[PDB]
Write a protein that binds this DNA or RNA. Structure first.
Ligand SMILES: [Mg+2]
Ligand SMILES: [Mg+2]
Ligand SMILES: [Mg+2]
Ligand SMILES: [Mg+2]
Ligand SMILES: [Mg+2]
Ligand SMILES: [Mg+2]
Ligand SMILES: [Mg+2]
Ligand SMILES: [Mg+2]
Ligand SMILES: [Mg+2]
Ligand SMILES: [Mg+2]
Ligand SMILES: [Mg+2]
Ligand SMILES: [Mg+2]
Ligand SMILES: [Mg+2]
Ligand SMILES: [Mg+2]
Ligand SMILES: [Mg+2]
Ligand SMILES: [Mg+2]
Ligand SMILES: [Mg+2]
Ligand SMILES: [Mg+2]
Ligand SMILES: [Mg+2]
Ligand SMILES: [Mg+2]
Ligand SMILES: [Mg+2]
Ligand SMILES: [Mg+2]
Ligand SMILES: [Mg+2]
Ligand SMILES: [Mg+2]
Ligand SMILES: [Mg+2]
Ligand SMILES: [Mg+2]
Ligand SMILES: [Mg+2]
Lengths: 155, 81, 121, 213, 50, 122
RNA sequence: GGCAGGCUUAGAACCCGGGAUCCCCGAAUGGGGCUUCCUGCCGGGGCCGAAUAGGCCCCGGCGCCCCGUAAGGGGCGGGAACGCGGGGAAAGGAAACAUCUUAGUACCCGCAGGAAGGGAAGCCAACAGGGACCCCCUGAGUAGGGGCGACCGAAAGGGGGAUAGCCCAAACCAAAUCCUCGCGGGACAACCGUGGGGAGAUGUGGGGCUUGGGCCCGGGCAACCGCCGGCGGGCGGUAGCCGAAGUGGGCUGGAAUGCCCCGCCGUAGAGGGUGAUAGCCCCGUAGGCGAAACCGCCCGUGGCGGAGUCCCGGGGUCCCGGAGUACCUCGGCUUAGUUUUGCCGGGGGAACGCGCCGGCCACUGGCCGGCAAGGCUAAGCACGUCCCGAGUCCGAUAGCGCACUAGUA
RNA sequence: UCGUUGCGGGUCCGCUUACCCGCCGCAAGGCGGGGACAGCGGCAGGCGGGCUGUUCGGCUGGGGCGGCACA
């Protein structure tokens, strides 16, 4: 069984000191250096590698050492390498007309802010929510109805 | 190019009296094409070609043969009579 | 190839709109036990020139030679299952192939022996 | 989920022509068919007023603990002769309820052998009841694929999936066969009524002690 | 009109060809089920928009 | 080189009924920039070519000048360019990448069996 | 569902795959088009004719804008819905109404794909740490916006689906490069040799991509990175083939599948047909087998190229690191973004790694996090013309407007 | 008023190449006049029913005028 990296959930000020663990994106470069591989070797072996992470967790190191020992002793089959196996690039037609050049990206706001925070994204998201009648868009005026009802029932 | 022959009363009278054959041909055929087609297919000499387009959308040609060939005889030869 | 859907509308649509090469399968009829022991097959498509025994209807028990097969209606005309119209002409009753049993096989067609060997295999 | 066409009865070019024409003020056809009524639920060809909506909630959710408690209650109901008879099973010939057979019965792989086992254990009369009580139901279900209404006869419980007894007994009329971990109310109480004629294997009875609890 | 264009004349010829009820043998073949044709018309009543 | 007129876009005064917020003209501009407008105009002039980028060059009182770079994706000299392949398309058969990656992985395990297993176990 | 005459056992009909034909208009493209038809020039051919004149007819070429040295190539139109960019209301609500909402909606213009868009930290956090992106559940109608009214309304974080990382420019070298064509070799390829032409010092190519690099030195291959899709094999799709057991005795009946009695199969009692209600009459079902041809996917193998570009160790403090950009101001649209969202227009307008950017008003100091203004990227997510399946759906005034020679008259 | 707006000489005078206007010319360019004004874009103030959206309360011996018996 290929191990999965364990990382700390970030301890927010709201939490007040309660900390928990989660599945990380990949093993750190320090953790991999602890066992004697770089990012290329680890990805060839099929491990998930997160070159961005700075932390080094001993549980991650122990799991890596154990699984690598099974792999080198032949009692385990590594998965396929964690590298791109396909290269599909489509011909681009009308990039200027669809606003995919640099000027179009700047006008759409992707240079300055995130895609989720751009205005076209907000428009599409609210349109989809209103069409499907999703979480908050199933009722219009839900907040005001809640406010008045809370006032009446908690007076 | 020739679709068929017209063997009506008017066509038979024209054949017997004026040495004319009446044919139904393609709507795009010209007088030159009709005359050459008649001469090639039947080996007669064409005197002149009059053409019209019927109200049912077909081109009808009155082919007057030269004065050595019989329209009635040619009709009997082809057996469309 | 005849629908595998369990819905009666799809079943009836497939049966009614089946092309001719599929409607040939609806002419299958049980062979007699003697023909089964002779040929090694249990069913064969009814063919003109076969002799069949009518197992149901007014003409039950009548054996005759199949004079005509209609693939479109999936019907067969059997000699003896006849009647007279108002003008005196004799007409055949259209019999479904599933209501007859084949007692004689018309095997003069080379393709029919191939079908027989395929079913006996 | 069931529904109608969302635009059904509503895509005609129609309009109310007001009062003064001596006719009722419902919407009517605009064109050559002018005085013909249109779009109202009381008009021929008009929209259906309150049709079924595909977003309607048909599922009645149940708490997991409540569902398991009901399953335990139904299993307890199978052990009584009175409940099974009240449901409508023939249990005169059965030696004892709760009815349990040895674990060797799971190796039977043929319908004839399974029928012999049912005959020797006294469940064949109930299977006969189902087979003779199949009927063509009244109404429009015949056109929609519900032509035959068949009774329930015997629920067979095996220890695990892929035992040959499942394929041996699954062709009997009204007989349901499930592994013990796949027990559910649909087989335990058909019609919403408790007490089903159940044949438990011994290994299934052992396996039951750690399930639905 | 006395003076016609050929396209309009050909469309009129198509209407003239199509204007006819189904044949009696077709009626007998269909067992009196096919009696009328949608292309049947009268010159004074139904007008082609040629 | 594309020359165009600067200023806000030609906003139209509505000729039908509007609420007062929707009747303004002056100061209302388009969400497109003149650079993207110039790119689209050059793309119209050169049909079938693809716009790669563009850059401002100069201004006068009335006009703004841009330079638009366009590529012909049907040219063999453009198809194989590592940058222009992102615009003109590029495919790699999966058998090539999968085979090479599998061979690399096999050789890496074989090497690590010698060079890393004793250090790992000790 | 008629009357004839034919085709077919020399193998038809029918089904599947591959071809041939394919009128005129139509992006329509030689030019016109108030009639889906008419007509021009050039080249070849035919006919009338005494003729080689003249005339008529047939066939082929001749649209605009572009790329390319040329040869040659590209765009145009369509598609039920979905996708991307732009322009952009009112009715209604607010119990009047203008800010507001409705709504960045209806609708319009433009542009793609089988999905699109997004995507690889000038990030988020808060001194503890996450670690590209999209989509789903939640955070949450919380923060916040708002005649603080109606009403509008996140994000971080957590749980999942899925998983993937790279390149261009520059530093340094300086034509070592690429395209095309002829010939010879080379799985029909890539590529190799050779010769001509085109691009290219206004820089082809090498190198480089945060685990920054260049530069210098040392050691080692498990080097690294690319090009072609030939050969073999497997699987699946586009027709099909096989597949158990009563047509038993009597009754009623025009006719039984019904009733009484008696047998049988069941991995098959899903369902339909047959002269009334059929597990065993038939099609089918459980289950199994299958393609000359075309198509798709996986596996093994095979041919070739590069400037060592790969890995490890040390040195450095020299070089490179994206502009009307960042930023300021005015007007406007938008946004939860509020002295604080994004963008467009007018005006002003940086620095350079000893630098620059961010950490909910501005500045200062500390601390923390990063490297904008260049390009790409599978998977996981939308839709329904179409194909398959299902149904506590309707059952001819119902259900789609259309169960039918309905988008028809 | 900001920009377009440049070149000289002492806020003013001059110049032309900008820019504008007309003539000739297929075009290339030439001629003449004006000239950093004008025109043009942004911002700001004034006039502005030319055009867009709205509001023109209630009680009431029917509505209106009146009154406020509207606090
Ligand atoms: Mg809301
Ligand atoms: Mg004439
Ligand atoms: Mg309806
Ligand atoms: Mg309910
Ligand atoms: Mg009824
Ligand atoms: Mg009239
Ligand atoms: Mg309004
Ligand atoms: Mg044309
Ligand atoms: Mg298009
Ligand atoms: Mg509404
Ligand atoms: Mg209102
Ligand atoms: Mg109003
Ligand atoms: Mg995609
Ligand atoms: Mg994409
Ligand atoms: Mg909104
Ligand atoms: Mg270079
Ligand atoms: Mg069969
Ligand atoms: Mg059978
Ligand atoms: Mg940078
Ligand atoms: Mg009725
Ligand atoms: Mg109807
Ligand atoms: Mg001025
Ligand atoms: Mg001004
Ligand atoms: Mg007014
Ligand atoms: Mg008022
Ligand atoms: Mg009043
Ligand atoms: Mg008053």
């Amino acid at each position: 069984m290929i191990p999965k990296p364990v990382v700390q959930v970030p301890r927010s000020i709201k939490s007040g000191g309660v900390t928990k663990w989660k599945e990380g994106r990949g093993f750190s470069l320090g953790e991999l250096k602890e066992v004697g591989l770089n990012a290329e070797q680890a990805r060839l072996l099929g491990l998930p590698v997160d070159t961005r992470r700075d932390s080094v967790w001993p549980q991650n190191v122990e799991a890596l050492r154990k699984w690598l020992i099974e792999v080198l002793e032949g009692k385990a089959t590594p998965p396929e390498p964690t590298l791109p196996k396909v290269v599909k690039v489509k011909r681009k037609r009308g990039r200027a007309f669809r606003g995919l050049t640099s000027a179009g990206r700047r006008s759409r706001g992707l240079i300055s802010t995130r895609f989720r925070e751009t205005h076209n994204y907000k428009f599409k998201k609210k349109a989809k929510e209103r069409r499907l009648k999703k979480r908050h868009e199933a009722t219009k005026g839900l907040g005001n109805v809640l406010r008045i009802s809370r006032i009446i029932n908690e007076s | 190019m020739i679709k068929r022959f017209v063997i009506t009363e008017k066509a038979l009278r024209l054949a017997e009296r004026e040495n004319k054959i009446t044919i139904i041909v393609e709507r795009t055929a010209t007088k030159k094409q009709i005359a050459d087609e008649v001469q090639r297919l039947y080996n007669v000499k064409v005197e002149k070609v009059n053409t019209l387009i019927t109200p049912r959308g077909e081109k009808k040609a009155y082919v007057k043969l030269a004065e050595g060939y019989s329209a009635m005889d040619l009709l009997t030869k082809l057996g469309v009579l | 190839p005849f629908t595998a859907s369990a819905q009666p509308r799809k079943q009836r649509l497939s049966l009614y709109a089946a092309p001719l090469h599929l409607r040939r399968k609806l002419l299958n009829a049980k062979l007699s036990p003697e023909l089964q022991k002779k040929l090694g097959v249990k069913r064969l498509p009814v063919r003109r020139g076969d002799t069949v025994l009518i197992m149901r209807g007014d003409f039950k028990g009548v054996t005759g030679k199949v004079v005509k097969v209609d693939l479109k209606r999936v019907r067969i005309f059997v000699e003896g299952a006849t009647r007279t119209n108002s003008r005196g002409q004799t007409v055949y009753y259209p019999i479904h192939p599933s209501k007859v049993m084949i007692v004689d096989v018309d095997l003069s067609d080379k393709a029919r022996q191939k079908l027989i060997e395929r079913r006996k295999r | 989920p069931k529904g109608v066409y969302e635009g059904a009865g509503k895509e005609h070019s129609c309009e109310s022509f007001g009062v003064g024409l001596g006719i009722a003020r419902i919407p009517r056809y605009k064109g050559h068919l002018w005085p013909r009524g249109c779009f109202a639920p009381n008009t021929r060809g008009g929209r259906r007023a309150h049709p079924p909506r595909p977003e309607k909630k048909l599922h009645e959710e149940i708490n997991w603990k409540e569902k398991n408690l009901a399953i335990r209650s139904a299993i307890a109901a199978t052990a009584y002769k009175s409940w099974v008879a009240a449901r409508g099973h023939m249990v005169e010939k059965v030696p004892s309820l709760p009815l349990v057979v040895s674990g060797d019965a799971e190796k039977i792989a043929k319908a004839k052998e399974a029928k012999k086992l049912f005959e020797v254990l006294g469940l064949w009369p109930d299977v006969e009841r189902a087979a003779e009580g199949v009927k063509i139901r009244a109404g429009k279900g015949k056109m929609r694929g519900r032509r035959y209404k068949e009774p329930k006869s015997v629920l067979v419980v095996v220890s695990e999936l892929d035992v040959p007894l499942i394929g041996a007994v699954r062709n009997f009329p009204g007989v349901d066969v499930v592994p013990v971990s796949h027990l559910n109310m649909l087989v335990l109480a058909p019609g919403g009524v408790p007490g089903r004629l159940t044949l438990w294997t011994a290994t299934a009875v052992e396996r039951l002690k750690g399930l639905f609890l | 009109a006395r003076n016609k264009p050929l396209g309009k004349k050909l469309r009129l010829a198509a209407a003239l060809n199509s204007n006819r009820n189904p044949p009696l043998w077709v009626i007998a073949k269909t067992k009196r089920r096919v009696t009328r044709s949608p292309a049947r018309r009268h010159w004074r009543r139904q007008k082609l928009k040629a | 080189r594309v020359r165009l007129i600067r200023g806000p876009f030609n906003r139209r005064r509505p000729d039908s009924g509007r609420r007062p917020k929707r009747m303004g003209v002056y100061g209302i501009t388009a969400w497109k920039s003149w650079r993207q407008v110039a790119e689209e105009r050059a793309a119209r002039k050169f049909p079938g070519l693809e716009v790669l980028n563009s850059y401002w060059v100069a201004d006068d009182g009335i006009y703004r000048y841009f330079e638009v770079i366009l590529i012909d994706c049907n040219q063999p000299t453009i198809q194989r360019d590592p940058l222009y392949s992102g615009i003109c398309g590029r495919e790699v058969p999966r058998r090539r990448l999968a085979r090479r990656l599998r061979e690399r992985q096999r050789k890496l395990i074989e090497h690590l069996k010698k060079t890393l297993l004793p250090k790992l176990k000790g």
